[PDB]
């Protein structure tokens, strides 16, 4: 059995979309407020997260079917999944060696420690690293990693979503491609698909935990003033 | 004739306040999003203006009499005069030689050109330089420069001000010190005082012009997203 001309074209678009929105050299990071090791890392990570939102948005607009949803549903989907897509795409810079995100020399090597100088506790940063390690081990192909991001972004179960039947349909078609692709092109991945869907569940927990921490942060103006307009909007609840 | 123990203590506080909020080495500028020469200079100047707002606020809180006004009046005064105080304090880094603000090596040397890569036109940047040149020539003492900033910040004629009689009184006392100081300690400054008050008028024009340019900028989200929470609040009209 094999993939259809349809599923194949979906993959082409997603992989191209990703390449178009993710620089493996992280050259743009020099434009962020420099890191510093009262939350000395907040200005840098805020800029990093903000830069990522923009990237996740560019990627989403190229997810086939997404541009056709209502503006409102597009926003509802982006708002609730943004933090998860960031965690997923960051796997690409996560090194199991140093248990950190290597995005450059010393300055752009993000260690668990740094995120703490940004308003987050270690008891909560632990599941994140645990997630990154598990995800890294799945040794996903670019096609599976790019599909996993689209699947996550099209979850019908997000607050604020309207046409949850149409989002439901789009996601299923994507889940099919991932399932078919894994079977056809992935030697040894008979149980991979089920592992990937389990990552979606973990992201939910990580998402909920981030909301709580971010909430505290956003109620303190001395801190929220350090965020960027876009982060305040995506993570804000003015929805 | 001479200054009173009162006027003298006002001066001590203002000069100290200024020293406490203005670094002549501009060492903090390395924490701003780096300059770049669609408005490539906006992220840097936004951070510069934002950093300055915070400084102007710290200076204001030490202006004797100011901390006693209502929170609302303090905000009304800061909102409407912030841009003017920035223009005044920046005289300290303005070099008549290169007609620019020298705040560092090549990267932090602000030329008329750069401000254009930030949303502003040259036909409007012209009065600014003209103002900086005139102000520089007045060769003010630190006591006169610091007084001029306090006088400007306590102008009763600002939209949103409530107790314009109390702000009126505070400013007069400050205008008296400046007048007395110039007479007692400033050789050759018989007409200086009148020149300084004329600078206040010019700042009004510059302020009004900035509002118009900033307004256009703030209605375009692709651009306003580049500003900082504090700039959006101080220059915003949600007042």
């Amino acid at each position: 059995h094999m993939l259809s001309d349809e599923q194949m074209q979906i993959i082409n678009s997603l992989v191209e979309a990703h390449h178009k929105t993710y620089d493996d050299s992280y050259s743009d990071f020099v434009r962020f407020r420099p890191p510093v090791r009262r939350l000395s890392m907040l200005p840098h990570l805020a800029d990093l997260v903000s830069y990522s939102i923009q990237k996740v948005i560019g990627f989403a607009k190229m997810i086939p079917g997404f541009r056709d949803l209502t503006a409102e549903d597009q926003i509802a989907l982006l708002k609730s999944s943004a933090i998860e897509i960031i965690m997923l795409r960051s796997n690409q810079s996560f090194s199991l060696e140093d248990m950190s995100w290597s995005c450059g020399g010393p300055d752009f090597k993000y260690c668990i420690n740094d995120v703490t100088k940004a308003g987050h506790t270690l008891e909560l940063l632990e599941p994140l690293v645990k997630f990154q390690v598990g995800l890294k081990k799945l040794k996903l192909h670019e096609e599976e990693h790019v599909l996993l991001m689209a699947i996550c972004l099209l979850s019908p179960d997000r607050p604020g979503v309207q046409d949850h039947v149409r989002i439901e349909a789009l996601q299923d078609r994507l889940c099919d491609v991932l399932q078919a692709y894994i079977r056809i092109q992935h030697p040894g991945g008979r149980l991979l698909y089920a592992k990937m869907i389990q990552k979606l569940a973990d992201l939910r927990s990580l998402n909920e935990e981030h909301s709580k921490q971010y909430r505290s942060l956003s109620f303190q103006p001395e801190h929220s003033m350090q965020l960027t307009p876009l982060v305040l909007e995506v993570f804000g609840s003015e929805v | 004739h001479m200054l009173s123990d009162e006027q003298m203590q006002i001066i001590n506080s203002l000069v100290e306040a200024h020293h406490k909020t203005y670094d002549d080495s501009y060492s903090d500028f390395v924490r701003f999003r780096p300059p770049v020469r669609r408005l490539s200079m906006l992220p840097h100047l936004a951070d510069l203006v934002s950093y300055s707002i915070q400084k102007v606020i710290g200076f204001a809180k030490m202006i004797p009499g100011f901390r006693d006004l209502t929170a609302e009046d303090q905000i009304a005064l800061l909102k409407s005069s912030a841009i003017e105080i920035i223009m005044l304090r920046s005289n300290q880094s303005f070099s008549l030689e290169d007609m620019s603000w020298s705040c560092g090596g090549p990267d932090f040397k602000y030329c008329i050109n750069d401000v254009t890569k930030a949303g502003h036109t040259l036909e409007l940047l012209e009065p600014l330089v003209k103002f900086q040149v005139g102000l520089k020539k007045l060769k003010l003492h630190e006591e006169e420069h610091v007084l001029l900033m306090a006088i400007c910040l306590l102008s009763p004629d600002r939209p949103g001000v409530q107790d314009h009689v109390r702000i009126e009184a505070l400013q007069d006392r400050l205008c008296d010190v400046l007048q007395a100081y110039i007479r007692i300690q400033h050789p050759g400054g018989r007409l200086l005082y009148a020149k300084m008050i004329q600078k206040l008028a010019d700042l009004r024009s510059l302020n009004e012009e900035h509002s118009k340019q900033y307004r256009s900028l703030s209605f375009q989200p692709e651009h306003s997203m580049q500003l900082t929470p504090l700039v959006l609040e101080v220059f915003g009209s949600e007042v």
Binding site: L230, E233, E238 | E222
Partner: peptide, 10 residues
């Protein structure tokens, strides 16, 4: 109002 998001979404 999500001004930024609407804008970035074209």
């Amino acid at each position: 109002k999500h001004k930024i998001l609407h804008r970035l979404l074209q």
